[PDB]
Structures are given as C-alpha cells and as structure tokens.
C-alpha cells in the first residue's frame, strides 16, 4: 500500500478559511494532503513548487482565491501566471503537468474544498509515485 | 543546536482525542530536532492552559513554542498573548491546525492515518518554529495636519467634520469661491428648500473656522511621500486682490478688498460668468455671484487690458495688483480628502438633440440658473430665441446615460430624474397653466420620500411619456421644438410640441480630475470615476493609504449622500491623526540591498505601489516604504536573487517547512 | 537614408574597403563616429594569435580601428555581458558596438533588467549564418579538408557551405554535409532564426548584393533614428558611400532570410524530437545534469542571470559541497531563465561536463514563447513575470474552459 | 590605462594546464574569460580557474622585504636583504662546505623559477640539495613509471583517450581534482565508449562509468595481480608485443601465480575481476588513467596488453600541481640536471662544466625535502625556501617547526606572509602567477605560456630577478638573464629534450610536448612511439608481492 504525497499550499485568507469550514462543517475527505498556508499565494514562488517536486513530491496543489476576490487585490493573478509557466516546465522536463494544479477555492465553500481533496487524491493514486524518486535524485 | 522548542498538544476535550492517539503525537514530538518539552492538555485555550505554557517556557528555557491545536484564525491572538507574558516574542509562537484539518475530517475509521498526519503537522510546525526570529512592532507617525481638495458640498462638510474633530485642515478650491454645484442650484429635490439658504450657514462657518485655511483660487501642483507624511506643492493662482490680511502683511494699513464692487462699477470689459452657464455677462474683475465666501472679487488677468481704473475705483485701500504672478506654496499634510466633484458630459455631441444648433435647447444646469432669482433674469424662465415666456416644457431624461453607442454614458447619473421632477415643479409653479412633459425611460425615484415626490409631481399635472426621444426637429418660423418619440405605453409614435427643450445630461468628472487622482497614485474605474478600496465595505478608502474619496468624484450622488460620504471620509482621515501613529503591519517585505541588483522589476508587481528605486551607498537599488506594504508576499516570491525578506513567512522558513514534510 | 531605407554602402579609404569583409561599411562606420566624438569607445572583435582566436577589444585611439576590420567566423563569444561585467554597463561611456543577432537580443534582454543603458549603445549589428567553435572549424580543417589548419589564410560560410582560402587554393564543403556529420556551425546557430537584426540601430550584411558589387559593397539597412543619424554624418563628412539598393537585390536577400527561417526550423524540430518526451526525457535530463560540477560558468555567462548571489548557492535550495548536485541545481535556471533565453549558446559551450544546456533551456523556451506569445529580444517589453495584467490571466483562465488550472491548457 | 586588455594565462591550480584570459582594467586584474582558441579546454574552466584572480590584488600581499631584527619585522630595502643573505650565505658556505645549505622549491613556480633556482644552487657553491614539494603534493609515481617505461611521464595527451575503446580509471578523483581530464571521460561517454572505474569510494568520477568495481582500500597491488593472472591465464596477452618490446616475462608469470582467488586481500569477487580482466585484455586500445610499487604494477598491466605505443593507450598519471612535471623537468630534484640528465653519469656532467663555466659538480646524491628536514639542526644549517610553507604542509606540524628553529637562517621568499616565514630571518617578496612571464609544463607534458598581466604590488620582483641580484651580489657569473626569454634560451642551450622548443613555436595556442629535440620537430604528444626509454629499447615489467599495511 504506497501512500501518496500531496503538498498544499493554501493561502489565508480563501483557502485556509474554506478548510476550516469544511472542517466544521464535519466534511469527510481522505488524509493524504497536508497544507503549508502563506499569506497570498502570491508568495508562492516557482522555486517552492520545484523543491517539493525534487524532494519527492508525488502531487502539488496550491489553492487561492476566485480572480477579483483576492485580500490583496492582485496577488492570484501573479500566481497563476506562475503556475501556467510551472505547468509548462513539468510537461517540458518530462513530468506528468497533471501531477501538480491550481484550484480558487473560496471561504464559503467547505464543500468544494472536500470535492478537491478527493479530486487530488484519486488523481495521484491513479498516476502512481514520482519518476523523480526513482532517478537519482 | 540553539533554538529549543516546546510542544503542547490540546485535547480539545475529546474533539482531537476521539479522532487521534494524543500519546503517539506527543512520543514523537519528543525526539523532533529541536524539542525541548512535549506536553498534553484538554483545553488549553484556557487559562490553566496558558499558565501551563508559562510555566514551560521559564523551567525549560524555551526559545519558541508550538501548540498542536486549532486553526491560527481562532485563537492564534489568544497564544501570541500568552507566549509573551512569559518573556518571549510574540511571533516566537507558531501553530498546528489539528482540529479543523485533521480531526474533524477523519472520524470514521481513520485512526492511524490521522495520527500519522497530526505527527506531519507537528513536524512542518516545529521545522518552522526552528527559524522564526523577534518580530518588534514599530510604526510611522503621522503629520496632524489633513487636506481637503474640492470646495463644494463634500469638500465642505469633510473640511468642518475635521476642524470640529480639533485637526487643523487646509480646504483646496480651484475657484475663487467654494460653494460648489449646490450653490449653482434654485431648489433641491424632494423638500423644495433654498439651496443658498441651506448653504450658507455652512459657507460662512468655514470661512469663519480657526481650524481651517481656506485657500480658494488655487490648485495643486505636485504631491510626494505616503500616509504618514504627504508633501504637497500647491500653486496660488494670481488673485489679482488682496485680502485684508494679505494687505496688512504686505505693509499698508488700509484695508483690502471689502467687497465695495466699485471696480466691477468701472471696469470696461465684458466676458461670459461660468457660474451662470456662460449666459450672464461679467467684467474682468469680477465675483461669481453676490453670495460668495470669500467675497474679494477676482480679476481675469488673461481677459484684462491693464486700463487701470479698476485701482482709481478702490483708492485709499490699494487691493488690487495688477502685476502679480503664482506663488509656490510647500504644504506637509497627513491625510489628503478629495472631492473634485463634477462637471456635465458635452451633450453637443448626439446630434439628433440639438443642443447647441437650435436656440431653445438648453441643458439642466443652465436650466437652474435661469429660474433661480439670483441668475441672468429674474428668475422668469423665458425663450432664449426671443424672451417670450414659454407655454410648452419638455424634458428629455437620460440624455447621453444608459447609453452603450460610445457616444454617451453606459451608467445611470442616479439625479437626473429627480432633478426633472423638481424642474417640471418649478415651471408648473411659477408659469401659470404652462404644461411639463417628462420623456421617460425608467423614473428613478429610490430615495427617501422620492417616490412621495414622484407622486406629488404626477398628481401635479405633470404629463409623463414613456419614451426616449427619438429626435428633435425645430421650425423655422417660430423657433418651437418638435419631439418625435414613441409612447411605448399607449404604443403610438408621438411628436410633442414645446417651446422649451431642456436636456436632463449625463455627469462626468470635472476636467483635470483625472491629472490629479494620478498625482494621488488614485486608479481611476471603469466608468471612469475615482476606484475605491473595497466597493462594499470600504466606500470612502482608497488603495493609496492616506488618502479618501468624497462625494460626486467618487460616484454621481444626491447632496445628503454626498454629505454621509464626505463624512465618512472625513472620519476615516482623522482615525490615523487622532492615533498618532500607523502601525505598520507584523510581516512587512525588507529589501537586502546587498542583494539586490537594481533591475526593479518587481516595482510594478505590488498592487499599492510600496515598491521603488532608489539610491543607496552609490548603488540604486529597491526602497520598501513599510507605510504601504501589507505583507502579501508578491514581491518576496518572485524576486530571483531572494533579495527580498518577508519575515516570518521567509524563503528559510517555507522551504523548511516543505523539507520536513518529506523527512521522517 | 532616413529609417527604413535599404543601401549599398562602402569606405571612401582604399585600405578599408580592402580589408573590410563586404566592403568596410561597418569599420568605416564605427571610425567615424570615434573622429566626430559620438561615442566615447568602440567595442569590437580582433585577430587573436591567429583567424581562429576572437578577442573583444575596447578602442579608444581611433587608427587602432582598421585592425578590426573583417569578419571572425570562430568568434562565438557574446558582448554585452562583458560590457555589463567591465564597463557599468556603460552608464557613463557612451558605446559603439558592433553586434550579432544573439548580442543584440542579449543587449535588449540586459536593458530590460536595467543593467545596460541603451541609450549610451550604438548597436551596428551584422547578419549571421552561423558561427563555428574554433577547435571544431580546425578539427574540420585538419579532418574533412585534408589541410593544415595553420595554412589556412581565410574561412569563410558563403551560400550555403563553408570555403577556406588556403595557401595553394581554396575548398568549399556544403554546410549541411558537415553538420550531419557532427561539425559545421554550432548547435544552437542551426535553431537560430534571428538572421537579420532589425532590433539593432544599423543591420549590416551582404545579402542582396549583386553583380558588379558582389563583395565590393554592404547591404546597410537603416533600422532607427540614431543610425540614420550616424550614416547621414558618415556620408556628409566624406567618409562612407551610398547608393540605391537594386530591389531584386532585396528580393533575393528575403528569399535568402526566409530559407534560413525554415533550416532553423528544421534543426529545432530535429533536436527537440530527439531529446525524447515522457519519462525518457526526464531520465536524459537527469543524466545529463547529474554530471555538473558547479562552476557556475553557465549562470555567469546567461545574459539574463543578472542576479548578486545566485539562487543555486543560497543553502535552503542546493546543500553545499556535496557535489552530486540535486535535480534543482537546473531546475532553478529553468524556472528563471526559460521564459526568455535567447539561445546565445554560452550556457552550453562554456560547460566543463559537455550537458547541453541551450538544448533543453531553449527547448522551455519555445514552449513559453507559443503560449504566452513573449519573443525575448526585443523593444524592451517586460519579462512575462515582471508585468501582469488582469485582463490577460482573466482570458487565459478562460480559454481553457475550467474553474481551475488542471487540464485542457494544450494541445 | 588599458580600459579592457584580455591576457592569455595559463592555470596556476592544477596539471591540466587550461588556458584562460585575464582581464585587466586600469592596471588591475578585473576577471576571467573563456579563450576558446585553446585546444586544452576549449575555454572550460572549473571552479577554482573560474575564480583564480581573486588573490592577486589582495591586501595581504607583501610588498617590502622583511629583516627580523630583535624579535618582530622590520621593513628593509632591497640591498640591505640581498647583502644580509649573500653575507651570511657565504659565511655558511665557507664554514660547512657543500653539506649545509639547503634548497627547497614549490612547484607552482614557472619552469624559468626553477631552472634559475637550480642553477644558483650548482653553479655557485657547488651541491646538489635542492628538491620540490613533487615528492609529497604528487607522489613517487613518476620514479616507479620511470623504472618501467624509462620515463615517468604521462604516455600519452588526455583528448587521446578519445580515440581510445575502454578508458579504465583507477582509483580517481579525475572529477574532482583535474575536472577538465575528466571532461574528457565525459565525451568519450558520449561517444561510446566503455568506462571501467575502480575507485574504492563511489565518487563523482566513478558515476560517469558503465561499470564500478569497489575494492578495500590500499590493495591495488592484489587487484592488478588477479587481473594480470587471469589475463595470462587465457592468453590474452600480446605475445608479438611482449617477445619485441619486453623483458621480465618469466618472473611475471613466477610472481603473479599466488593470486588464484584474491578475495578477503581485495573485496571483489572473481567473476567481477574476470570480467574487467578480460574487457581490458579484449579491446584494441584501452587506456588506464591512474591516480612505488602500485603505479609500476599499473605499468605492468600495460605492458602485458600491448597497450603502451599507439594512439588511446597508456598509463596517465594526473600529477595533482601546475608546474610538478616543469618543476622535475628543469632540475629541481634531487640527482638530475635537465629533462632527467641523471647527473651520476660523468658525461652530463662535463657537459654542464663546458656550458656553465663552471667546475667540480657534486655528482654525490642530494637530499629530499623530508631528508633535509631531518638533519635540519645537524649538518644542514642555512636553507633557501623558494614557495613552500613546509609548517602547514607537512606532517607533525611540530617537529618542522622544532627543525626550522634548530636552523641558522632561514629565507622564506613567497608571495604571502604564512606561518613559515616567521621563523625566516629575512623574508623576500614574490610575485604571483599573473605577474610572471614564464611557462609551465602541464599534466601531459605540454609547455604551455605564462604572460605577464599586471605588475607586482610594491618593490616586489619576479623570482628570477631575485636570484639573478642575489648572484651578482656573490659574485656568481652566469646569471645576466635580464627577462624569461634568456631563461629559456640557457635552459635549452644545455639540455637536448627540450633544444627545438623556442618561444617562436610557444607562442602558438597548441604549445609544445616535451621530447622535441629539433627546432622544426612538431612535437612528441606520443612517447615511446617506436622504442622505450631504458638501457635497451625495451621496457621491464616487474613483479610485486602484496605486502598487508
Ligand atoms: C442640474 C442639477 C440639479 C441637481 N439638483 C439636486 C437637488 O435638487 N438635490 C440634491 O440633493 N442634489 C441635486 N443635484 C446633485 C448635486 O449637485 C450633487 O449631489 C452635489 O453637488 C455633489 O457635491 P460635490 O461637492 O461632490 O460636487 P461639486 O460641487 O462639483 O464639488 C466640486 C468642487 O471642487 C472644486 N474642484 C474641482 N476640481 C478641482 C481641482 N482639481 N482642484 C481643486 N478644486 C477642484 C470645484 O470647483 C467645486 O467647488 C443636482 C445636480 C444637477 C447637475
Ligand atoms: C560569425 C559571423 C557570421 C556571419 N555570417 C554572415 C552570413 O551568413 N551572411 C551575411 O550576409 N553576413 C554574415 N555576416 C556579416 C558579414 O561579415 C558582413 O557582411 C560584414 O561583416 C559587414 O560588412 P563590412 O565588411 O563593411 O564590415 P567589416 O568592415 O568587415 O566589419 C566587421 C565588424 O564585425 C566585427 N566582428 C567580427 N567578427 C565578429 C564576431 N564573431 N562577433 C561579433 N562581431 C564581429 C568586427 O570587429 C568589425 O567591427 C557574419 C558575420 C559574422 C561575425
Ligand atoms: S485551544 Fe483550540 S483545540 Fe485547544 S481547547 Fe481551546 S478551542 Fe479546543
Ligand atoms: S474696488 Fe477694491 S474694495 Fe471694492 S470690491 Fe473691488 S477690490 Fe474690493
Ligand atoms: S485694469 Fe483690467 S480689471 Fe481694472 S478696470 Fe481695466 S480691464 Fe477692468
Ligand atoms: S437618473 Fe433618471 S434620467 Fe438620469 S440617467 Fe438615471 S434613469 Fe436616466
Ligand atoms: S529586489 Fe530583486 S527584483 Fe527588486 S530590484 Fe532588487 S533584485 Fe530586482
Ligand atoms: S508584500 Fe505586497 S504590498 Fe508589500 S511590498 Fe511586497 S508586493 Fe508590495
Ligand atoms: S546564435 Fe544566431 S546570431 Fe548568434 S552566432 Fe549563432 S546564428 Fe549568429
Ligand atoms: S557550466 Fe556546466 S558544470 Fe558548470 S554549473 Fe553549469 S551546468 Fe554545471
Ligand atoms: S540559458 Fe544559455 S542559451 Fe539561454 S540565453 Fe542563457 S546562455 Fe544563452
Ligand atoms: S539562475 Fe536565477 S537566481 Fe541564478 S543568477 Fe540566473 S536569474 Fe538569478
Ligand atoms: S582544470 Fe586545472 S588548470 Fe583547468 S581551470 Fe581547473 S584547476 Fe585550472
Ligand atoms: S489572499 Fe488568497 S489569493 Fe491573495
């Protein structure tokens, strides 16, 4: 039984918020993510993607706010510019780009955030282990 | 080696217990890198909880502590407080959310796997305690001085609300009088009062105020620095005539300018008074109007011919200079208000209204003046083609709004059927058995007794044809104006004959408006209005810190939601004065300038413009100015070189926290 | 004459005209504008030891000039980042260089990141077909010419293949039959498709002459205000000649651009298929950058690395001193560097290991250059991470039909 | 005022010898740059020739000589210093005769440093205790590569292992130390060719290779033994090679026999050592890249395999400093003149008496600097050390430090100010590696040039000025060498391997190969193309026991 490796990123104020709802809202969802919560995901640089996909990251998943609804007022946008060009850079180094995404998670909705875990869950079940642990990393 | 974390883990009172082993995370906390104490509790968001912290930080020697509990958002204050009544840092404390994240959504039948994912949390949470440094709150002070820029109704009331609140405020008028539109209009919708009447009281208590500089026929010319400090240069316009203080600190006893009129008396030219719409003459020294607050008659320096009889008409008190130029003026203010109003949209254009080709086709504006008392008649609303009182009225609402050809507005200007309502009042009053027709297209009648009004107009006499006019032909004979339109009620096609046409135009910032939202840093919206902080919950506020948004320019508005606005405004300003200090927030971006390579990139990546380049040591690099920056982290996460610190969310901690994810 | 204008241009002195490649339009340029104090030195390429050894040189005497005239086509070496590195990036010189395509893309890369002044720079850019890796044009040489390399007077790339004048005669290989054998022009000069650069102040080269001026004359194309300026100044004062370009002179000089258009784009598909895709190419890049040693030479050399301290040494992201580096020692310089490279090569023939950097880096940045529509090196438009703009991530998100950023991205 | 000058150095750090461009700015050395025009490493450097002009301008530089007088230094002039040394120098001389003094010398000189050093060392006061620091900083792998091919030199270049078929590295650190003699391993990876590494530790050098073989450390005798057992003992061996161009077979094959099954003295199993054997033994050309008795049992290898005179074979020590090879080459050792003259023999030694103008020469053997270091107090009083900072370099720090103290008059000329030159009594500035005009003799026996770049700080001087003034001061003749270029004329003027390599043919980015006797000759990148370099025109295979640690 290999246990997947999903890292989260989430931040605050939306997305952080969203699973504390979900959570009181008593959602059930497997335990395979866990969460790093910056402030704006914005904060979110390239190289923290890529370091967790090195270290042995078998899926990524960064959460922020719905585009116009960020506490910031511009920081998801900068974020999902990077992560356009990340998706890019693991399809062109061979990667699966499917391995790692983005999702706009509000704070109203605990049960989308649910819907997302499973979502994340079965897709990296389904994709199996990194190739990046078995190279020699 | 030196850091020593202490770990303590919250039963919750059988709301984590029930769901994970407390003993298991506890055990394992125990031989983390850098543990000194792991301790358990039921309830540590209580005070025994918080004495038990103490207590563990003095025995043990902590450096930082972490608590296994619920989410940061609900009781990370609580934990701050008590982490620093014990002798340690405030944001020395860092949190694992093991209630609403691990306990509450793994109940059922997932016993390992949630402690295994308590033991992650605690880990990523004791890898970033590990890194996290002192953290002293500082702040900026504030200048106690506020700016009000715009003299009109918003202006006005900001200015006073201010001065009341003890804050001494400089009021910025680009004309040579404040009152603004309102002291332009008769009467004001619903209530029918005086406009003069209700505005000069508070005309004369501005002028009359100790707390505020009431500086009139001037503008401003520069403006540099954030909410802490505003430098502003303003220009003095020459006025041409000095006051009675200006005259006694220029040297000469005598007096300047009591508002004789003499000058006015004498002078030889004659120019159109904006203030009137253009339709009343002036000379080229001049006052709006005879209700003006400063009443120290202006001379129009670009329409004098330097006759000089204007002096020999004010002799003995030598007011009138007619060889001075602008002066420069250097203000430091804290706050900045702005409330630059209004101006009506060029209804020259949509040529099928002949607004400009056909004499009897007038604006709304233009309108208020002829029937006030105070304009170009004696408040006899006559023909313009031959002075002959009209019979016939037509109104055209919506002219040039809720318009998407380019041409017009796409928006609705909120008055402009109130105000047509009060003007078909106005005529039917005071015209006997003269009839008003309303062209309408959706009466907007929304305000408190606005209906009641609506009401009162129809039961009147007022005719109302729902339809936007079509066009607008005039006969050649008489130069009476025939309306073609639809009554879409009834479905019929209509051509109302009128002798008068007035225009209910759309409103638009005031020229020169958006140089000067610039000169503020202030974003313009997409109707072209000054953009708020937050359309919901911050009205007044401004991405720009330190500056505050009031009336009109804000938002097309009737004059007691211009005044609740200007209030607002004026109250969000005074709270930083009043304070002393803008705390600067706990996570603010650093720029380590000895690496940073000047590309400057990044300035144009933060939403409230914290970011620029300057000079330092001989080098530019980035300046962070702390008053703007809300730690978002835009900057820090982009940055290639990492020459940007955001402190306690740093590259150091984050990576540290994704390095202990996949550790042990 | 005036922005636009296609010309024949020439040195009024014999001796430049001589020892000029296509008629000494460029060194008569730049001589002029160090006589009339436009500009304070000359940056410039000079024979070495021999016609192999390329050597930038700064000129400040003016009769020093005319030893730079003629062409190197082993010079594979990048000027700007020098200018940057050893000059302040002329903050306080005014500078005439002259330039290839790949210098003049690396000139607009570093005015972007504010590190040069453009405005104290007169780029007098030339055409380029492809430069060759001096060992490699000797290994040639000594290999598929049966000649001494010492021997050879000239070398040269004209229509298509490589010519050497040597003592005794002259050879003529067509380009591509070397390159199929693992010689010619360099890797990335076979994916290069910036021929002619028109981003520079003056574009200067022989293509589109014809008849009686074969290699008596330059094809001067006027691409700015300062370089119409400067040939106006060069013409009046007695020291360069202009005529007239014939138009089937441009026509076949197109017809020349657009064949090197298509060749470049063939070697682009030909590498990029061949490093592989999936895990495979995973695998090969893992390999490949297994092997690095952290000179550093490959981020000191990058136009676009820029940086003070180089994210590779900071320690929370590569581990000191052990020197199998992990994966993200490139994945790094991916990141920063792939959304605009410009495929100047240095990163891959300065590599003690031999890993093909500008293969893979350039490989991203194909990629980035489809989606994001960003050509790196030109007019000075921000990095696609410097400038973000609402509208343009709002349609992005949009055209791919989801409320998140997972699938339907590609094609 | 030179705003930007590129100046083609040669590395100071290691053998390689890689060729890269000083940038000077004003006067001062600004950068590196790629000089792609080498053929060495076509403008690839590694981290340390990336950054080798850091140290040149640094604060810590000594720019006046130094006299201890009473305790702390004092700053003196440059007669004062060189009168002081010639005084007590020949004071020494005359009271102890040839025993006492002493000559020691880095090999990170250029090769006119140490010829002159030598020379000064012979042609005045006549003794031959002068040596390098080759014997500890490389090792004794060229006196055991001497005893087999006759000469201790690498056999063959580095890029010629690209034409070979089964590069065999043993026991490297070619990665680490000498990175660009591996970028050769890389291409020949690439170009497919078989790699067999036998480093005892997993290394960065042993990742590139197709096959690794891990054995304990200190028994790479035992491992050669089983190969070269296997190896005869199904005639893979080139008997045409052999019967022509060896001797010693019979006790080879008497000798190696007690090594069936090596294992427990090495830790590698026998069908692993069977397989490396025989895909030695197999391929047409295999070259063994190596880094006295081990590198004589590596000899031994090659001899039985025929691999020796050819292109892509040969044994190649690395020999781990810049000028370890110019340094051997010109003299600085021990019993040998120029290009290993071997001054037992009279014949040289009449040779040099008709050169240098000179008689009486030692003919005795000279002592190493370990050997000096020893009877440091006893009979060797007086020493001249030319770069070496023996405290930290050598061993039992403490006992180098007791000796130095037992000495009279120490002289500790070098570039810095190092635990050394404390105990010195007069303390005489160098010059760096971008401040000289000589040339070192890389790895692989190319002569490659050193050009002066900037000049040195103060009143220092290069370190053949120094010892010209010093003999003009003693009143040696002989020395009037007013630049490097005289240098190199006098050095070729005497020694024969060398005659044909003017600094006309120097000049060229190629350089030249050492065993160039005549002017027009093009160079020996190949050694013992056609002959070996012993009594006979044979080359003597030996055989070695394994003695345990
Ligand atoms: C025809 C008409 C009839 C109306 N009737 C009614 C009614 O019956 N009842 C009602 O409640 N509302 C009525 N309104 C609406 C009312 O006029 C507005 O709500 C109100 O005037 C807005 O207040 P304000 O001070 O923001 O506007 P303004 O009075 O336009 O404020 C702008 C002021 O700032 C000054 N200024 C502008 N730009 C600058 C600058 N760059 N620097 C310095 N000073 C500057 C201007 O000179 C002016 O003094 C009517 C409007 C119109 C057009
Ligand atoms: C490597 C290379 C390849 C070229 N390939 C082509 C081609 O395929 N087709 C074509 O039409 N033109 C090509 N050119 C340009 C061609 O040489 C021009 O016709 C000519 O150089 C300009 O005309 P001219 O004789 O008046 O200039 P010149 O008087 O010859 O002046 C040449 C100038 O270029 C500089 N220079 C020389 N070598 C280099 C170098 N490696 N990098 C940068 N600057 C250098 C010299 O310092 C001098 O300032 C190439 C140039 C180079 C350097
Ligand atoms: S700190 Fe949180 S988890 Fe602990 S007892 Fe209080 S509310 Fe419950
Ligand atoms: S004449 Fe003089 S006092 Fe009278 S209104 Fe004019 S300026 Fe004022
Ligand atoms: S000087 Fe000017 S303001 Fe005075 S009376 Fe003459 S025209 Fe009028
Ligand atoms: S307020 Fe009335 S007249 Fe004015 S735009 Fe709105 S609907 Fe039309
Ligand atoms: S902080 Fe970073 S991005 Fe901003 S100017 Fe400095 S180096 Fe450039
Ligand atoms: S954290 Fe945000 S607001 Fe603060 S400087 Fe950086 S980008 Fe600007
Ligand atoms: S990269 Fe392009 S411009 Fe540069 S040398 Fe190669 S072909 Fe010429
Ligand atoms: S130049 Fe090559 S070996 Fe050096 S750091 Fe870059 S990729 Fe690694
Ligand atoms: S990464 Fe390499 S190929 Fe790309 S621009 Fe930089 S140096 Fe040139
Ligand atoms: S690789 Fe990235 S961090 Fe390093 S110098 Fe280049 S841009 Fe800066
Ligand atoms: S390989 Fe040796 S010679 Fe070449 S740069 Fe490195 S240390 Fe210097
Ligand atoms: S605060 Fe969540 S996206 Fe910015």
Known sequence: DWKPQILAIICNWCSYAGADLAGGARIQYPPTVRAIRVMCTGRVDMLFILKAFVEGADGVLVSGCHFGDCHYLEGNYKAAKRMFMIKNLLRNIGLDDRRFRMTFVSASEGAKWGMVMEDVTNTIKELGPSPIKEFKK | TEPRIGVFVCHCGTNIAGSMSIDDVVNYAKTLPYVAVADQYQYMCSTPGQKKIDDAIKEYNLTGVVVAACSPRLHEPTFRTATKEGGLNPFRFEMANIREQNSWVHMHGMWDEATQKAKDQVRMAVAKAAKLEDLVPKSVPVEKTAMVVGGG?????????????????????????????????????????????????????????????????????????????????????????????????????????????????????????????????????????????????????????????????????????????????????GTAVLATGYELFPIENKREWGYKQFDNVINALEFERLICASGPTGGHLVRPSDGKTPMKVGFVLCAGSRDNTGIGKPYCSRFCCMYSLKHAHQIMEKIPGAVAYLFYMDIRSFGKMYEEFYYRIQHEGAKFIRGRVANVLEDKETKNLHVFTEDTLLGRPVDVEVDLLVLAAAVQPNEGANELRKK???????????????????????????????????????????????????????????????????????????????????????????????????????????????????????????????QHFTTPQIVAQIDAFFAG | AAKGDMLYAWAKDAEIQKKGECGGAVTALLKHALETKMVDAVVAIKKGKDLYDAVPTVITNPEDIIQTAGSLHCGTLLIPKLIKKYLNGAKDMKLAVTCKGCDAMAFYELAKRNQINLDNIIMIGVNCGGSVSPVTARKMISNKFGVDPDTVHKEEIDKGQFIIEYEGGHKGIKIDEL????????????????????????????????????????????????????????????????????????????????????????????????????????????????????????????????????????????????????????????????????????????????????????????????????????????????????????????????????????? | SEIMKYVATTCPYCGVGCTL??????????????????????????????????????????????????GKFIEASWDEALDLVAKNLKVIYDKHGPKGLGFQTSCRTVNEDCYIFQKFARVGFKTNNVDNCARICHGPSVAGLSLSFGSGAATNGFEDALNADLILIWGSNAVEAHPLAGRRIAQAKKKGIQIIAVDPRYTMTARLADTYVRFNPSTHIALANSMMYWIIKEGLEDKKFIQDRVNGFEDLKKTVENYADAEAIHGVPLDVVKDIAFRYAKAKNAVIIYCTDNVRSMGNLALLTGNVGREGVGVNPLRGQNNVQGACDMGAYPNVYSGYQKCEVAENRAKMEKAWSVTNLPDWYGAT?????????????????????????????????????????????????????????????????????????????????????????????????????????????????????????????????????????????????????TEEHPGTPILHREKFATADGKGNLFGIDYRPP
């Open chain 2, 153 to 333: 109704v918003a202006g006005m009331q900001a200015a006073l609300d201010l001065a009341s609140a003890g804050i001494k405020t400089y009021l910025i008028e680009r004309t040579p009088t404040i009152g603004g539109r309102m002291s332009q209009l008769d009467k004001t919708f619903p209530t029918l009062d005086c406009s003069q009447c209700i505005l000069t009281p508070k005309m004369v208590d501005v002028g009359r105020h100790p707390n505020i500089e009431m500086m009139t026929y001037t503008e401003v010319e520069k403006v540099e620095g954030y909410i802490g400090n505003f430098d502003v240069t303003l220009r003095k316009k020459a006025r041409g005539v000095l006051t009675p203080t200006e005259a006694t600190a220029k040297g000469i006893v005598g007096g300047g300018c009591n508002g004789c009129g003499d000058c006015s008396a004498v002078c030889p030219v004659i120019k159109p008074n904006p203030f009137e719409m253009g339709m009343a003459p002036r000379k080229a020294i001049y006052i709006y109007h005879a209700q003006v607050m400063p009443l120290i008659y202006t001379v129009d320096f670009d329409s004098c011919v330097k006759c000089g009889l204007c002096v020999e008409a004010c002799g003995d008190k030598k007011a009138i200079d007619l060889e001075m130029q602008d002066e420069f003026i250097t203000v430091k203010v």
């Open chain 2, 520 to 646: 503020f840093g202030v974003s313009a919206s997409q109707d072209g209005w000054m953009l708020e902080a937050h359309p919901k919950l911050n009205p007044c506020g401004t991405t720009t810190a330190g500056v505050f948004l009031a009336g009109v320019c804000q938002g097309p508005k009737d004059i007691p939601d211009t005044v609740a606005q200007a209030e607002g405004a004026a109250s969000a300003a005074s709270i930083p004065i009043h304070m002393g200090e803008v705390e600067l927030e706990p996570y603010f971006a650093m720029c380590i300038d000895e690496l940073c390579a000047g590309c400057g990139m990044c300035v144009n990546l933060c939403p409230y413009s914290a970011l620029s380049l300057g000079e330092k040591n001989g080098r530019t690099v980035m300046v962070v100015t702390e008053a703007k920056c809300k730690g978002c982290g835009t900057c820090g996460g982009f940055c290639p070189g990492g020459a940007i610190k955001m």
């Open chain 3, 179 to 411: 390159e199929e054998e693992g010689y010619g022009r360099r890797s990335n000069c076979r994916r290069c498709k910036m021929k002619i650069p028109r981003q520079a102040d003056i574009a200067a080269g022989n293509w589109g002459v014809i008849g009686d001026k074969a290699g008596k004359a330059t094809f001067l194309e006027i691409c700015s205000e300062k370089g119409a300026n400067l040939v106006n100044s060069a013409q009046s004062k007695g020291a360069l000649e202009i005529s007239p370009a014939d138009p089937k002179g441009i026509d076949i000089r197109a017809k020349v651009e657009k064949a090197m258009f298509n060749l470049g784009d063939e070697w682009r598909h030909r590498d990029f298929e061949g490093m592989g895709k999936g895990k495979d190419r995973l695998k090969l890049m893992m390999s490949e950058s297994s092997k690095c040693i952290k000179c550093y030479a490959c981020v000191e050399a990058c136009p676009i690395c820029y940086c003070i301290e180089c994210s590779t040494k900071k320690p929370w992201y590569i581990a000191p001193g052990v020197l199998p580096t992990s994966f993200m020692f490139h994945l790094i310089r991916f990141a920063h560097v792939s959304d605009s490279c410009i495929n100047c090569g240095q990163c891959e023939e300065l590599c003690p290991m031999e890993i093909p950097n500008a293969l893979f880096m350039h490989s991203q940045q194909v990629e980035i250059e489809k989606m994001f529509g960003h050509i790196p090196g030109q007019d000075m438009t921000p990095p696609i991470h410097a400038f973000v703009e609402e509208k343009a991530e709002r349609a992005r998100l949009d055209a791919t039909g989801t409320d998140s950023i997972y699938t339907n991205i590609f094609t």
């Open chain 4, 21 to 70: 461009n000083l940038v000077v700015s004003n006067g001062k050395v600004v950068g590196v740059e790629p000089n792609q025009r080498s053929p060495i490493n076509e403008g690839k450097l590694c981290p340390k020739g990336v950054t080798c002009w850091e140290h040149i301008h640094s604060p810590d530089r000594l720019t006046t000589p130094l006299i201890k007088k009473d």
């Open chain 4, 369 to 517: 600097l370990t050997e000096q270091i020893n009877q440091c107090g006893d009979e060797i009083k007086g020493m001249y050390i030319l770069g070496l900072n023996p405290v930290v370099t050598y061993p039992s720090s403490n006992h180098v430090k007791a000796q130095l103290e037992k000495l009279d008059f120490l002289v500790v000329q070098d570039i810095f100010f190092t635990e050394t030159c404390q105990y010195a009594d007069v303390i005489l500035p160098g010059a760096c590696f971008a401040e000289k005009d000589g040339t070192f003799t890389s790895g692989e026996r190319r002569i490659n040039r050193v050009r002066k770049a900037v000049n040195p700080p103060g009143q220092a001087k290069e370190d053949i000025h120094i010892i010209s003034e010093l003999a003009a001061k003693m009143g040696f003749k002989g020395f009037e060498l007013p630049t490097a270029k005289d240098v190199w004329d006098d050095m070729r003027a005497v020694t024969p391997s060398m005659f044909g390599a003017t600094y006309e043919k120097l000049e060229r980015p190629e350089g030249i190969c050492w065993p160039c006797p």
